[PDB]
């Protein structure tokens, strides 16, 4: 009777954009990125990557409400380092890792299918 | 089947920008046209065309004559008394 339509978990409609950004006033050099219609598929791996780089002091992710598909990532990076560029660098590193892992699996799968003899 | 002529709406009378509107009746005695005429009478920018003979002794004749006070309200916009009648001219009858 009120169940939200199924696709509401991944579709973005007009009047809202996938990503929004806001500056933090509590501590300098901190920013909040709001991602719409997205869940722990990425909210975890982004943090896991970003915690690798030592240039970032704080990185976090939280979903305001599970029924409301939305995630917010607050990051405070060391001075002279911009959160935007840190975030983009982390994601591009993650993409490289993912693609090269894909290729390694490709070669391994041919090896196995043709046989390990 | 007219591409650029669409059904009129009363509420468009206030709409800004230059416009062209046909109206009824040609005699203005009742005047759904007279409604917009009264709406815009003050403005001197608008035109009005009367392409036919008006009935004497009516608002048609009052507007036909150029006096501002036509009923007591004053008409300011410009009137042009055109003749697009579809009747027979003397040469037509003779021919």
């Amino acid at each position: 009777m009120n169940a939200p339509p199924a696709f509401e978990s991944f579709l973005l409609f007009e009047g809202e954009k996938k990503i929004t950004i806001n500056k933090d006033t509590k501590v300098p050099n901190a920013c909040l990125f709001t991602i719409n219609k997205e869940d722990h598929t990425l909210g975890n791996i982004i943090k896991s990557q970003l915690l690798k780089d030592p240039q970032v002091l704080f990185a976090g992710y939280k979903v305001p409400h599970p029924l409301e598909h939305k995630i917010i990532i607050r990051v405070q990076t060391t001075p002279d380092y911009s959160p935007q560029e840190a975030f983009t660098n982390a994601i591009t590193d993650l993409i490289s890792e993912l693609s090269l892992l894909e290729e390694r699996f490709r070669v391994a799968i041919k090896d196995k299918q043709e046989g390990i003899e | 089947e007219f591409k650029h002529i669409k059904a009129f709406d009363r509420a468009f009378a206030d709409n800004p920008g230059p416009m062209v509107v046909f109206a009824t009746p040609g005699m203005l005695h009742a005047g759904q046209s007279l409604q917009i005429f009264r709406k815009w009478a003050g403005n001197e920018k608008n035109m009005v065309i009367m392409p036919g003979y008006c009935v004497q002794g009516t608002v048609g004749h009052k507007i036909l004559s150029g006096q501002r006070k036509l009923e007591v309200l004053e008409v300011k916009m410009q009137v042009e008394y055109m003749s697009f009648s579809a009747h027979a001219d003397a040469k037509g009858i003779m021919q």
Binding site: M1, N2, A3, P4, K26, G60, Y61, H65, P66 | -
Partner: protein, 240 residues
């Protein structure tokens, strides 16, 4: 007889005069939710769109009120009834001529409530005065009231199919006074035994105990994740 028509509970004195039916009062089953604060209560879209709240048309918000009115009924954020100053009652559920949709200051708008609105929220038997609390409404998809767990001690509810009634105050002065008196945090302590009642629910109690054990140790990433949700947080990590 008349005497039978007056004496009994259904008599005019008790079941009809002291206790009489009323509108603007939804009813449904409750469902726990810890994510939202104690003062908030979730409600379904259906109830929020079928329930009505009056508004006085003012220039400060006249633009928004008109932008809401032309939305009409059947669209969640919207108004279903417009009442003129003279008392003329025009409904929008039948899509009248667009001309009447014009607005001016002073009119009455029957618009649906959205988040932030105050609502009273009780559970009979209402034995002690603290079962009649107010709350701030929030909109959630599925069809059931949602309230924070710590609130279930004063209500003595347990979610096992216990339902709970929700009245919406209609006038603005009543809204304000309810806000300033019946809103929950203004009743943490009770007059009967001058004690706190909100307490702590069983599960968070056990969790906090096992957490605050004297030897608990926690990793950097986990701490950095936990500190996120502290609303009042300063923003500076503490020294390990």
């Amino acid at each position: 007889s008349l005497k039978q028509r007056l004496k009994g509970k259904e008599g005019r004195v008790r079941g009809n005069l002291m206790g009489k039916r009323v509108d603007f009062s939804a009813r449904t089953v409750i469902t726990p939710d810890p994510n939202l604060s104690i003062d908030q209560v979730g409600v379904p879209r259906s109830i929020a769109a079928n329930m009505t709240f009056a508004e006085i048309v003012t220039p400060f918000n006249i633009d928004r009120l008109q932008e809401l009115v032309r939305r009409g009924n059947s669209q969640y954020p919207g108004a279903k009834y417009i009442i003129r100053d003279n008392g003329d009652r025009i409904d929008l559920r039948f899509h009248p001529k667009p001309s009447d949709l014009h607005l001016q200051t002073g009119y009455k708008v029957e618009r649906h409530m959205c988040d932030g609105d105050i609502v009273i929220f009780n559970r009979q038997p209402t034995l002690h005065k603290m079962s009649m609390m107010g709350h701030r409404v929030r909109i959630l998809p599925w069809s059931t009231f949602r309230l924070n767990l710590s609130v279930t001690t004063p209500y003595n509810a347990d979610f096992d199919g216990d339902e709970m009634n929700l009245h919406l105050p209609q006038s603005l002065e009543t809204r304000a006074e309810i806000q300033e008196l019946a809103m929950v945090p203004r009743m943490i302590v009770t007059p009967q035994s001058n004690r706190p009642v909100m307490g702590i629910v069983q599960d968070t109690l056990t969790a906090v105990r096992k957490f605050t054990k004297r030897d608990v140790f926690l990793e950097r990433g986990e701490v950095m994740n936990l500190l996120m949700f502290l609303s009042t947080w300063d923003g500076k990590v503490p020294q390990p």
